From a paper:
The major interest of neutralizing therapies has been targeted towards [name]-[name]-2 RBD, which is the core region for the host cell receptor ACE2 engagement. Here, 3 receptor binding domain (RBD) specific monoclonal antibodies (mAbs), 58G6, 510A5 and 13G9, with high neutralizing potency blocking authentic [name]-[name]-2 virus display remarkable efficacy against authentic B.1.351 virus. Surprisingly, structural analysis has revealed that 58G6 and 13G9 both recognize the steric region S470–495 on the RBD, overlapping the E484K mutation presented in B.1.351. In summary, these Fab-S complex structures suggest that 13G9 and 58G6 adopt the same potential neutralizing mechanism, wherein they are capable to simultaneously bind to 3 RBDs, occluding the access of [name]-[name]-2 S to ACE2.
In individual complex, each 13G9 Fab interacted with one RBD in the “up” state. This may explain the decreased affinity of 13G9 to B.1.351, hence the slight decrease of neutralizing potency against this variant. Interestingly, the epitopes recognized by the majority of potent neutralizing Abs overlapped with 13G9e.
Numbering used by the authors:
A (entry chain D): 1 to 85, 86C, 87 to 221
B (entry chain E): 1 to 215
C (entry chain A): 348 to 545
Write the structure that this text describes.
Amino acid sequence: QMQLVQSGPEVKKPGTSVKVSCKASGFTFSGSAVQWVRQARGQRLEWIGWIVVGSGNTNYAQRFQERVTITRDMSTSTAYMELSSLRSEDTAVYYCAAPYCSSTSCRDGFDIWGQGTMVTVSSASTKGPSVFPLAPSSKSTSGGTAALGCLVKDYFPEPVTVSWNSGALTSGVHTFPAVLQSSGLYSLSSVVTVPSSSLGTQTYICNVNHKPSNTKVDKKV
Amino acid sequence: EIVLTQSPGTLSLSPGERATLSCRASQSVRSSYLAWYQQKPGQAPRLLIYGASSRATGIPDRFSGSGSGTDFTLTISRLEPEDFAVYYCQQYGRSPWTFGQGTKVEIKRTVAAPSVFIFPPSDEQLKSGTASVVCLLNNFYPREAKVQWKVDNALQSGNSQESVTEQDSKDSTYSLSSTLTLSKADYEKHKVYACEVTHQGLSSPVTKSFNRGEC
Amino acid sequence: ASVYAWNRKRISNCVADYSVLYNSASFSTFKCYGVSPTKLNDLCFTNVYADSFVIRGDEVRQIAPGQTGKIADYNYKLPDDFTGCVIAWNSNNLDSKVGGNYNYLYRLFRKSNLKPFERDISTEIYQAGSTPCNGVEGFNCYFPLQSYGFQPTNGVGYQPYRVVVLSFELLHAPATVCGPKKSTNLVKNKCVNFNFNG
């Protein structure tokens, strides 16, 4: 089946180097070509370069004209992209794309796309999460609909999975996007909107799970 | 070497009406060498039209590209309520291959309902020596939403980030999770705390406030 | 020449001293299909064509009738009923020098497979897509010739080798291209069992 299997996520450091690989399977990889693109979390796409699998001829963008080397392996049908003198301001997701090209003739567009690998670069090592309550202000907010929540602050790295009442409370939940602090640790908030008559009656507990630190924290709100 | 402007920036069609996104080139291009992709939140973009006129495999019949010599447009015959996402142009001139600015089509049919809420700093956090205040404007509409922060009846300068959600399916509305944090002693300095919002359907800010020692 | 322009010199009009050349103390590979390599002196042919080129040592195994790969498909295909010999010996002393040697080329792309003994020297831009290349190099418009990275300090795998393929062809001809005939000194005045010239 037309598909690319791509590498896994990594955490890298300033001044280091990284190499990303994505295998090809389900088509005649011997005649196609591969290009590499990178994208920050919600920005305009950025083009890196491309390489002909057969000849090995390459091409690089002017920004990355010097500090990138794209290689390939004809034997195992795998392409590598290498970044040199990496910095913290290149944290993005990297995609490799190639057209479906099978031994006769082949398409004028990059049909096949990998799932993308996220490369994270921060000086913070491994912070671990810390949950906090969001006092439902019974003075004002305990009227009709009322909202409480949990504060997941200063954790590294992503992601943290937050659920309420061991997965029972699903309607009205708002998991907010993680925010990067100037300290190098990530942070997001999880709130929930509930009737004020049941804000005190039902107990609301959030299950914050941070797999890198294997931290499981429940907090009374 | 090739510049691909993409306008209009955003579009708001209820599902089914007939739509066009547009990108433009400032140099020479071979008309079959511009392609369109859409990217759902969290996924790699998929190929939609290559050659600016030929649909790829599996794409609905409902779309067709236009593709002039250097003037390019993708006709949408209708929004089937999935199709609300971003789209990108990409060129294959002998020059370096670039990408467009990316255009996003939003869904409407969403009652603007902004409920301003507050959450005071906790006790163990104040113990921790830093400060965090949470202001949540939930279930509101449209994307336009600005919140400033009232302290001491004057405007304070920086020191606040933003975080917004993408359109939830049912209510179609938005929520912004804006955290205003502070230092230690200056947290024990000012008395009056607030967060206030300027909105299209909410003319008057709530400007919700509270006191030190009272909550 | 480069393998995409394999050179055919019609060796003939001469005494075919094969089992003379045999022991040149240099040949790595000497495979003779259909004829005994040490009796080739006695089995002689009408015309011998010496097709010469230079390939890298990993690719020699493809040079055999009915074989498949890259060389035998897009550069030079041996006939499936081939009757002749194949000769190849390492030549890295000569065809590589510091800085590499980029004067050797080999075809990399082709629409259709070479019919056996076909020579093709076109320089057209290969078109792997679905649109006219209109004489324009770029995506889906590839140049078909890739050089060789010949360096004297590689392994034997990429290390250049010279190859000569003698294609023994036979028709209804007097077949003058034949090995030397040995002779024995004249012994007179004894009942001997002679065989003079004919």
